[PDB]
Each structure stands twice: as structure tokens, then as C-alpha cells.
Amino acid sequence: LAEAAATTTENPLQKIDAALAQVDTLRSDLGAVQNRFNSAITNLGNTVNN
Amino acid sequence: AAGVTGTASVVKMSYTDNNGKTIDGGLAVKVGDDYYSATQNKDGSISINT
Amino acid sequence: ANRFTANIKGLTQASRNANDGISIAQTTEGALNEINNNLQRVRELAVQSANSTNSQSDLDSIQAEITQRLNEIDRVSGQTQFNGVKVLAQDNTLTIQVG
């Protein structure tokens, strides 16, 4: 369980920005992988047809 | 064991970009210009990730 | 008549041999088309990369999809196969009798 802050946060901008960087990185990874899956779908389609 | 020659110390990572924005990470071990990602032992000592 | 019948049967089976050849060639071409698609998409990304406005974060973002697409190319190349023949895993020369 989280404590209660006793002193004001220093450089909160940097920490919030680090969090934002993490989340955006993961979202971009998701975006790439989704394309991976779609290309795999087309691969499978051509394979089954042939 | 790895044969790394030099002083061993624990440092905190800071990164800056071309925009001028800056961020900070976790902990690591720096020998000369080299670095190694570090993990905190529960007692306050430090270990190198492998 | 016996010799003619022998020739007839030989040519008949050669028909199916050639058809198997066409099938395998079709499969290979099919794989190559999608490989080409991925390469051209990665080319688009590479051209995008030239934008010096990009921050290191955006550069890593693009690098991520580039890496994923390349690894997907390797996956398809490794996994494609006709009746077990790794048609994209080694230089080869396959025999097809037609006479």
C-alpha cells in the first residue's frame, strides 16, 4: 500500500513524461504487431488457395 | 569474474534528446565509460542484471 | 501397340508431374509476393525515417515496426514449405521428369 507524501514532489514533469514514454512505446509495439498478424492472415490465405 | 578492469560504482541513468527534453531511469553500475543495468538487493546492496 | 501404350502411359504420368511442378511454382511465387509487400512497407518507413524532426522516441517507434516486419519476413521464409520442401530455406534444384 502506498504511503502519503510528506514533501512536495521534485521534477514531477520528468516522471510523468517517463510514464508517457513507456505507455506510448507499448502502444507503438501493439500497432506494429497488429500489422504482423494481418500480413500473416494474407499469407495463410494465399497458402490455402494454392 | 568477467574480467572488467576499473573502479565499480553505482550510478543513476539520465538521458537527453535533440529537443532538449530529459528523463531519468533506474540504477546501473558504471566502470569507466561502460555501464550495466543494476538491480536493488532488498538490503540496500546492488547487483548486476544478467 | 505395346510400345505405343508404354509411351502413352509415360506421357500421361508426365502430365501430373508437370502439374505438380506448376503447383510448387505457384506456392513459391505466392510466398514471394507477400515478402515483397513487407519489404516495400519497410521501404516506406525508411523514407519516413529521414525526417530530422523526429525525436529519438519517434525514431525508436519506427524502428519497432521495422524490426517486427523484418522478423516477420524471416518467419515466413523459414516456415513456408511444399509437402515439407523448405522452398525458401536453401538454394536447391528440384527434378521434374517431363518425358
Q: What is the DSSP string of C22-81?
A: HHHHHHHHHHHHHHHHHHHHHHHHHHHHT-TT--HHHHHHHHHHHHHHHHHHHHHHHH--
Measured between beta carbons, the chain C residues lying within 8 angstroms of B19 are 55
Q: How was this structure determined?
A: cryo-EM
Per the document, the length of chain A is 50
Give Cα C72 to chain centroid, integer Å. 13
B24 CA to chain A: closest CA distance, Å? 7
Establish if A14 touches chain B: CB-CB under 8 angstroms: yes
Count of Cβ atoms closer than 10 Å to residue C34 Cβ: 20
How far out from the chain centre does Cα B23 lie? Answer: 15
Cell 523459414, located at residue: C78
Under DSSP, the state recorded for C82 is B
Length of chain B: 50
Give the closest-approach CA distance of A7 to chain B in angstroms. Answer: 20
Letter for the amino acid at C30?
Answer: G
Three-class DSSP category at A40: helix
Does B22 reach chain A within 8 Å, measured CB to CB? yes
Contacts by B34-38 with C-beta closer than 8 Å and gap 24+? B34/B4, B34/B6, B35/B11, B38/B10
- Residue A14 exposed, middle or buried by CB count within 10 Å (0-12, 13-18, 19+): middle
Strand-pair category, B22-31 with B9-16: antiparallel
Residue listed under C-alpha cell 531519468 = B24
Tell if the CB–CB gap between C34 and A36 is shorter than 8 Å. no
Is B42 in CB contact (< 8 Å) with chain C?
no
C-alpha C13, offset from chain centre? 27
Nine cell digits for residue B49: 542484471
Strands across the sheet containing B46-48: B9-16, B22-31, B34-40, B46-48
Scan for cell 536493488, then name that residue: B40
Q: Which residues contact C24 (CB under 8 A, 6 or more apart)?
A: C82, C85, C87, C94
Resolution (Å) of this entry = 3.7
Q: Please tell me what DSSP assigns to residue A29.
A: H
How many angstroms separate the CA atoms of C87 and B13, rounded? 48
Identify the closest residue of chain C to A49 by CA–CA distance.
C27
Long-range contacts of A3-11 (CB under 8 A, 24+ apart): none
The values of phi and psi at residue C81, to 5°, are -170, 145
Residue closest to C68 by CA, chosen among A37, A15, B16: A37
What is the Cα Rg of chain C in Å? 22
Q: Which three cell numbers stand for residue B33?
A: 565509460
Residue C48: count of CB within 10 angstroms of its CB? 12
